[PDB]
Enzyme design. Structure first.
Site, short mmCIF file in Angstrom:
data_model
loop_
_atom_site.label_atom_id
_atom_site.label_comp_id
_atom_site.label_asym_id
_atom_site.label_seq_id
_atom_site.Cartn_x
_atom_site.Cartn_y
_atom_site.Cartn_z
N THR A 220 52.22 105.43 97.09
CA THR A 220 53.32 106.36 96.89
C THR A 220 53.43 107.43 97.97
OG1 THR A 220 51.99 107.91 95.43
CG2 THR A 220 53.12 106.04 94.40
N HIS B 287 46.85 117.40 101.33
CA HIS B 287 48.03 117.27 100.44
C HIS B 287 47.56 117.04 99.02
CE1 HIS B 287 47.49 112.86 100.23
NE2 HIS B 287 47.08 113.02 101.48
N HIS C 141 48.39 113.51 90.94
CA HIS C 141 49.58 114.17 91.54
C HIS C 141 50.08 115.19 90.54
CE1 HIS C 141 50.22 110.93 94.65
NE2 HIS C 141 49.53 110.28 93.73
N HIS D 147 45.84 108.70 89.06
CA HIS D 147 45.80 107.33 89.75
C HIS D 147 44.33 106.90 89.92
CE1 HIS D 147 50.10 107.89 91.46
NE2 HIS D 147 50.04 107.55 90.18
N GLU E 85 54.50 111.05 88.97
CA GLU E 85 55.28 110.23 89.91
C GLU E 85 56.16 109.27 89.14
OE1 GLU E 85 52.42 109.07 93.18
OE2 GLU E 85 53.71 110.61 94.10
N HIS F 77 42.52 110.05 91.89
CA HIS F 77 43.13 111.32 92.30
C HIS F 77 44.28 111.65 91.38
CE1 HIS F 77 45.55 108.26 94.47
NE2 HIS F 77 46.55 109.05 94.07
C1 LIG Z 1 44.18 105.94 105.89
C2 LIG Z 1 45.14 105.38 104.88
O1 LIG Z 1 46.15 104.80 105.21
N1 LIG Z 1 44.78 105.42 103.59
C3 LIG Z 1 43.54 105.96 103.00
C4 LIG Z 1 43.88 106.96 101.92
N2 LIG Z 1 44.79 106.34 100.93
C5 LIG Z 1 44.37 106.22 99.65
O2 LIG Z 1 43.21 106.40 99.34
C6 LIG Z 1 45.40 106.09 98.55
C7 LIG Z 1 46.46 106.99 98.55
C8 LIG Z 1 47.47 106.89 97.60
C9 LIG Z 1 47.36 105.95 96.59
S1 LIG Z 1 48.56 105.85 95.30
N3 LIG Z 1 49.23 107.31 95.13
O3 LIG Z 1 49.62 104.95 95.77
O4 LIG Z 1 47.81 105.53 94.13
C10 LIG Z 1 46.21 105.16 96.48
C11 LIG Z 1 45.28 105.17 97.51
C12 LIG Z 1 46.03 105.85 101.51
C13 LIG Z 1 45.59 104.80 102.51
C14 LIG Z 1 44.92 103.52 101.94
C15 LIG Z 1 44.41 102.62 103.04
C16 LIG Z 1 43.05 102.40 103.18
C17 LIG Z 1 42.57 101.64 104.25
C18 LIG Z 1 43.44 101.14 105.20
C19 LIG Z 1 44.81 101.34 105.05
C20 LIG Z 1 45.29 102.04 103.94
ZN LIG Z 2 48.48 108.53 93.80
#
Ligand SMILES: CC(=O)N1CCN(C(=O)c2ccc(S(N)(=O)=O)cc2)C[C@@H]1Cc1ccccc1
Ligand SMILES: [Zn+2]
Length: 257
Positions: free
Chosen positions: A196, A61, A93, A116, A103, A91
Protein backbone atom coordinates in the site's frame (compact mmCIF):
# COMPACT_ATOMS: atom_id res chain seq x y z
CA UNK A 1 11.37 10.43 -2.42
CA UNK A 2 7.79 9.65 -1.12
CA UNK A 3 5.73 10.26 1.98
CA UNK A 4 2.27 11.11 3.04
CA UNK A 5 2.77 14.99 2.93
CA UNK A 6 1.06 17.10 0.26
CA UNK A 7 4.09 17.21 -2.13
CA UNK A 8 5.23 13.59 -1.73
CA UNK A 9 1.95 11.88 -0.85
CA UNK A 10 -0.42 9.22 -2.22
CA UNK A 11 -1.85 11.40 -4.97
CA UNK A 12 1.72 12.12 -6.26
CA UNK A 13 3.17 8.58 -6.01
CA UNK A 14 2.44 7.68 -9.66
CA UNK A 15 4.99 10.31 -10.93
CA UNK A 16 7.83 8.18 -9.37
CA UNK A 17 5.95 4.80 -9.25
CA UNK A 18 3.68 4.39 -12.26
CA UNK A 19 2.25 1.07 -10.95
CA UNK A 20 0.27 3.39 -8.49
CA UNK A 21 -2.37 3.46 -11.31
CA UNK A 22 -2.21 -0.33 -11.90
CA UNK A 23 -4.99 -2.88 -11.89
CA UNK A 24 -4.29 -4.61 -8.59
CA UNK A 25 -3.68 -1.66 -6.25
CA UNK A 26 -4.47 -1.69 -2.50
CA UNK A 27 -6.17 -0.83 -0.26
CA UNK A 28 -9.79 -1.14 -1.47
CA UNK A 29 -13.29 -0.59 -0.14
CA UNK A 30 -14.88 -3.95 0.49
CA UNK A 31 -18.60 -3.81 -0.63
CA UNK A 32 -20.25 -6.65 1.17
CA UNK A 33 -23.15 -6.93 -1.31
CA UNK A 34 -20.48 -7.50 -4.03
CA UNK A 35 -18.27 -10.14 -2.27
CA UNK A 36 -18.38 -13.80 -3.43
CA UNK A 37 -18.59 -16.52 -0.78
CA UNK A 38 -16.04 -19.18 -1.70
CA UNK A 39 -16.45 -22.60 0.04
CA UNK A 40 -12.97 -23.67 -1.15
CA UNK A 41 -11.34 -21.19 1.31
CA UNK A 42 -9.90 -23.03 4.26
CA UNK A 43 -9.58 -21.47 7.72
CA UNK A 44 -6.52 -19.25 8.38
CA UNK A 45 -3.96 -20.95 10.52
CA UNK A 46 -1.22 -18.86 12.17
CA UNK A 47 1.56 -20.39 14.22
CA UNK A 48 4.16 -17.88 15.38
CA UNK A 49 7.09 -18.48 17.69
CA UNK A 50 7.72 -15.49 20.03
CA UNK A 51 11.52 -16.11 19.81
CA UNK A 52 11.42 -14.92 16.11
CA UNK A 53 10.64 -11.26 17.22
CA UNK A 54 13.81 -9.27 16.52
CA UNK A 55 13.72 -5.47 16.31
CA UNK A 56 11.48 -2.41 16.24
CA UNK A 57 12.44 0.46 13.98
CA UNK A 58 11.30 3.93 13.18
CA UNK A 59 11.15 4.10 9.37
CA UNK A 60 10.23 7.76 9.13
CA UNK A 61 6.66 7.34 7.83
CA UNK A 62 5.80 4.55 10.30
CA UNK A 63 7.43 1.97 12.50
CA UNK A 64 7.99 -1.73 11.86
CA UNK A 65 8.44 -4.69 14.15
CA UNK A 66 10.66 -7.20 12.28
CA UNK A 67 11.05 -10.92 12.77
CA UNK A 68 13.81 -13.43 12.09
CA UNK A 69 12.79 -15.17 8.88
CA UNK A 70 15.51 -17.77 8.26
CA UNK A 71 13.23 -20.74 8.93
CA UNK A 72 9.62 -21.80 9.36
CA UNK A 73 9.32 -21.13 13.05
CA UNK A 74 6.54 -18.54 12.36
CA UNK A 75 4.15 -19.25 9.55
CA UNK A 76 0.70 -18.56 8.07
CA UNK A 77 -1.09 -21.46 6.29
CA UNK A 78 -4.69 -22.09 4.99
CA UNK A 79 -7.16 -19.54 3.62
CA UNK A 80 -6.56 -19.20 -0.09
CA UNK A 81 -3.01 -20.65 0.03
CA UNK A 82 -1.54 -24.08 -0.58
CA UNK A 83 1.99 -22.73 0.23
CA UNK A 84 3.16 -21.85 3.77
CA UNK A 85 4.09 -18.12 4.21
CA UNK A 86 6.79 -17.00 6.62
CA UNK A 87 6.18 -14.02 9.01
CA UNK A 88 8.57 -11.12 8.59
CA UNK A 89 7.00 -7.99 10.15
CA UNK A 90 3.99 -6.31 11.48
CA UNK A 91 3.08 -2.62 11.54
CA UNK A 92 0.13 -0.26 11.69
CA UNK A 93 -1.40 2.58 9.74
CA UNK A 94 -3.30 5.45 11.36
CA UNK A 95 -4.87 8.84 10.45
CA UNK A 96 -4.72 12.52 11.54
CA UNK A 97 -7.80 12.01 13.73
CA UNK A 98 -9.97 9.14 15.03
CA UNK A 99 -12.41 9.58 12.01
CA UNK A 100 -10.16 7.90 9.53
CA UNK A 101 -6.85 6.05 9.66
CA UNK A 102 -7.56 2.51 8.37
CA UNK A 103 -6.45 1.68 4.80
CA UNK A 104 -9.17 -0.80 3.82
CA UNK A 105 -12.78 0.39 4.37
CA UNK A 106 -15.86 -1.89 4.66
CA UNK A 107 -19.05 -0.55 3.00
CA UNK A 108 -17.48 2.90 2.92
CA UNK A 109 -16.83 2.93 6.69
CA UNK A 110 -13.34 4.17 7.80
CA UNK A 111 -11.80 2.82 10.90
CA UNK A 112 -9.24 4.61 13.15
CA UNK A 113 -6.19 2.41 12.39
CA UNK A 114 -5.21 -0.92 10.78
CA UNK A 115 -2.78 -3.66 11.74
CA UNK A 116 -0.80 -5.37 8.89
CA UNK A 117 0.96 -8.72 9.63
CA UNK A 118 3.13 -9.46 6.57
CA UNK A 119 4.54 -12.81 5.36
CA UNK A 120 6.44 -14.09 2.29
CA UNK A 121 6.15 -17.29 0.26
CA UNK A 122 9.12 -19.37 1.50
CA UNK A 123 7.72 -22.45 -0.30
CA UNK A 124 8.52 -21.02 -3.74
CA UNK A 125 11.17 -18.32 -3.08
CA UNK A 126 14.39 -18.14 -1.20
CA UNK A 127 14.14 -14.67 0.40
CA UNK A 128 11.82 -11.78 1.02
CA UNK A 129 13.57 -9.81 -1.77
CA UNK A 130 12.85 -12.55 -4.38
CA UNK A 131 9.24 -12.95 -3.20
CA UNK A 132 8.29 -9.24 -2.89
CA UNK A 133 7.91 -8.59 -6.58
CA UNK A 134 6.05 -11.90 -7.47
CA UNK A 135 2.26 -12.06 -7.82
CA UNK A 136 2.13 -14.93 -5.26
CA UNK A 137 5.05 -13.64 -3.14
CA UNK A 138 3.43 -11.83 -0.14
CA UNK A 139 0.43 -12.49 2.19
CA UNK A 140 -0.63 -9.67 4.54
CA UNK A 141 -3.37 -10.07 7.25
CA UNK A 142 -5.17 -6.73 7.72
CA UNK A 143 -7.16 -6.10 11.00
CA UNK A 144 -9.38 -2.98 11.24
CA UNK A 145 -8.89 -1.14 14.53
CA UNK A 146 -12.01 0.60 15.90
CA UNK A 147 -11.57 3.38 18.41
CA UNK A 148 -13.05 2.45 21.85
CA UNK A 149 -11.57 0.67 24.88
CA UNK A 150 -7.75 0.53 25.37
CA UNK A 151 -6.32 -2.66 23.94
CA UNK A 152 -3.97 -4.16 26.46
CA UNK A 153 -2.37 -6.54 23.87
CA UNK A 154 -0.90 -3.46 22.26
CA UNK A 155 1.08 -2.70 25.41
CA UNK A 156 4.52 -4.13 24.74
CA UNK A 157 4.47 -2.42 21.33
CA UNK A 158 3.40 0.97 22.65
CA UNK A 159 5.92 0.77 25.61
CA UNK A 160 8.68 0.20 23.04
CA UNK A 161 8.07 3.38 21.13
CA UNK A 162 9.84 5.69 23.57
CA UNK A 163 13.15 4.05 22.44
CA UNK A 164 12.56 4.74 18.79
CA UNK A 165 11.22 8.25 18.72
CA UNK A 166 13.02 9.64 15.71
CA UNK A 167 13.71 8.43 12.14
CA UNK A 168 16.20 5.55 12.07
CA UNK A 169 16.25 4.68 15.66
CA UNK A 170 15.89 0.94 16.40
CA UNK A 171 15.80 -1.38 19.40
CA UNK A 172 15.66 -5.08 20.21
CA UNK A 173 12.04 -6.31 20.42
CA UNK A 174 11.95 -9.89 21.50
CA UNK A 175 9.80 -12.71 22.84
CA UNK A 176 6.51 -11.49 21.22
CA UNK A 177 3.82 -13.49 19.37
CA UNK A 178 1.75 -11.08 17.19
CA UNK A 179 -1.11 -13.63 16.80
CA UNK A 180 -2.04 -12.24 20.30
CA UNK A 181 -3.07 -9.03 18.45
CA UNK A 182 -5.52 -10.81 16.04
CA UNK A 183 -9.30 -10.84 16.69
CA UNK A 184 -10.81 -14.04 18.14
CA UNK A 185 -12.68 -14.91 14.84
CA UNK A 186 -10.46 -15.27 11.75
CA UNK A 187 -13.34 -15.05 9.28
CA UNK A 188 -11.98 -13.05 6.37
CA UNK A 189 -12.15 -11.43 2.97
CA UNK A 190 -9.42 -12.04 0.40
CA UNK A 191 -8.44 -10.29 -2.80
CA UNK A 192 -5.26 -9.93 -5.01
CA UNK A 193 -3.65 -6.58 -4.44
CA UNK A 194 -0.41 -4.66 -3.71
CA UNK A 195 1.87 -3.12 -1.12
CA UNK A 196 0.00 0.00 0.00
CA UNK A 197 2.99 2.34 -0.32
CA UNK A 198 6.07 2.54 -2.65
CA UNK A 199 7.25 0.43 -4.20
CA UNK A 200 3.61 -0.62 -4.63
CA UNK A 201 4.30 -4.04 -6.11
CA UNK A 202 1.25 -6.07 -6.95
CA UNK A 203 2.52 -9.03 -4.97
CA UNK A 204 0.14 -9.20 -2.04
CA UNK A 205 -2.73 -11.64 -1.32
CA UNK A 206 -4.76 -9.70 1.23
CA UNK A 207 -6.50 -11.38 4.12
CA UNK A 208 -8.84 -8.82 5.80
CA UNK A 209 -10.47 -9.93 9.05
CA UNK A 210 -14.19 -9.33 9.39
CA UNK A 211 -13.88 -8.73 13.16
CA UNK A 212 -12.20 -5.53 14.30
CA UNK A 213 -9.90 -5.09 17.34
CA UNK A 214 -10.05 -2.12 19.72
CA UNK A 215 -7.66 0.80 20.24
CA UNK A 216 -8.11 3.78 22.58
CA UNK A 217 -7.97 7.42 21.46
CA UNK A 218 -4.82 7.80 23.74
CA UNK A 219 -3.20 4.69 22.17
CA UNK A 220 -3.67 6.26 18.73
CA UNK A 221 -2.06 9.45 20.11
CA UNK A 222 1.08 7.40 21.04
CA UNK A 223 1.38 6.41 17.35
CA UNK A 224 0.95 10.04 16.22
CA UNK A 225 3.58 11.24 18.78
CA UNK A 226 6.26 9.27 16.87
CA UNK A 227 8.48 11.62 14.96
CA UNK A 228 9.43 11.51 11.32
CA UNK A 229 12.50 13.77 11.49
CA UNK A 230 15.95 12.63 12.65
CA UNK A 231 17.29 13.30 16.17
CA UNK A 232 18.22 16.94 16.66
CA UNK A 233 16.05 18.41 13.95
CA UNK A 234 12.69 20.25 14.41
CA UNK A 235 10.14 17.66 15.63
CA UNK A 236 7.65 16.56 12.91
CA UNK A 237 5.01 14.14 14.30
CA UNK A 238 3.95 11.16 12.21
CA UNK A 239 0.34 12.39 11.93
CA UNK A 240 -0.89 9.85 9.34
CA UNK A 241 0.23 7.10 6.94
CA UNK A 242 -2.89 5.62 5.36
CA UNK A 243 -3.38 5.45 1.61
CA UNK A 244 -6.85 6.20 0.11
CA UNK A 245 -8.76 3.21 -1.30
CA UNK A 246 -8.14 2.33 -4.94
CA UNK A 247 -10.37 1.02 -7.80
CA UNK A 248 -11.13 -2.74 -7.86
CA UNK A 249 -10.83 -2.71 -11.69
CA UNK A 250 -12.79 -5.87 -11.87
CA UNK A 251 -11.22 -7.86 -9.10
CA UNK A 252 -13.43 -10.00 -6.93
CA UNK A 253 -13.25 -9.91 -3.16
CA UNK A 254 -14.01 -13.36 -1.81
CA UNK A 255 -15.48 -14.15 1.60
CA UNK A 256 -14.71 -17.06 3.80
CA UNK A 257 -18.00 -16.68 5.67
C1 LIG B 1 12.70 -1.78 0.53
C2 LIG B 1 11.29 -2.09 0.14
O1 LIG B 1 10.88 -1.94 -0.99
N1 LIG B 1 10.51 -2.67 1.07
C3 LIG B 1 10.86 -3.06 2.45
C4 LIG B 1 9.85 -2.46 3.41
N2 LIG B 1 8.48 -2.84 3.01
C5 LIG B 1 7.74 -3.58 3.87
O2 LIG B 1 8.24 -4.11 4.84
C6 LIG B 1 6.24 -3.56 3.75
C7 LIG B 1 5.62 -2.31 3.64
C8 LIG B 1 4.24 -2.22 3.47
C9 LIG B 1 3.48 -3.37 3.52
S1 LIG B 1 1.72 -3.30 3.41
N3 LIG B 1 1.24 -1.85 3.96
O3 LIG B 1 1.37 -3.33 1.98
O4 LIG B 1 1.26 -4.33 4.29
C10 LIG B 1 4.07 -4.60 3.79
C11 LIG B 1 5.45 -4.70 3.82
C12 LIG B 1 8.13 -2.42 1.66
C13 LIG B 1 9.13 -3.15 0.78
C14 LIG B 1 9.04 -4.69 0.72
C15 LIG B 1 10.16 -5.29 -0.08
C16 LIG B 1 11.12 -6.09 0.52
C17 LIG B 1 12.21 -6.57 -0.20
C18 LIG B 1 12.37 -6.22 -1.53
C19 LIG B 1 11.41 -5.43 -2.15
C20 LIG B 1 10.29 -5.01 -1.44
ZN1 LIG C 1 0.75 -1.71 5.84
Amino acid sequence: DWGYDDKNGPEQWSKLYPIANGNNQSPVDIKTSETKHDTSLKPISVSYNPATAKEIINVGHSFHVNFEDNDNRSVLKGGPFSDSYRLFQFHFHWGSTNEHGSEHTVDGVKYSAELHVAHWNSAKYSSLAEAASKADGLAVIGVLMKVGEANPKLQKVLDALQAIKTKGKRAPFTNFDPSTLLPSSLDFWTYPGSLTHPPLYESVTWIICKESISVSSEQLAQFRSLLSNVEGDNAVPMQHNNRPTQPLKGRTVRASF
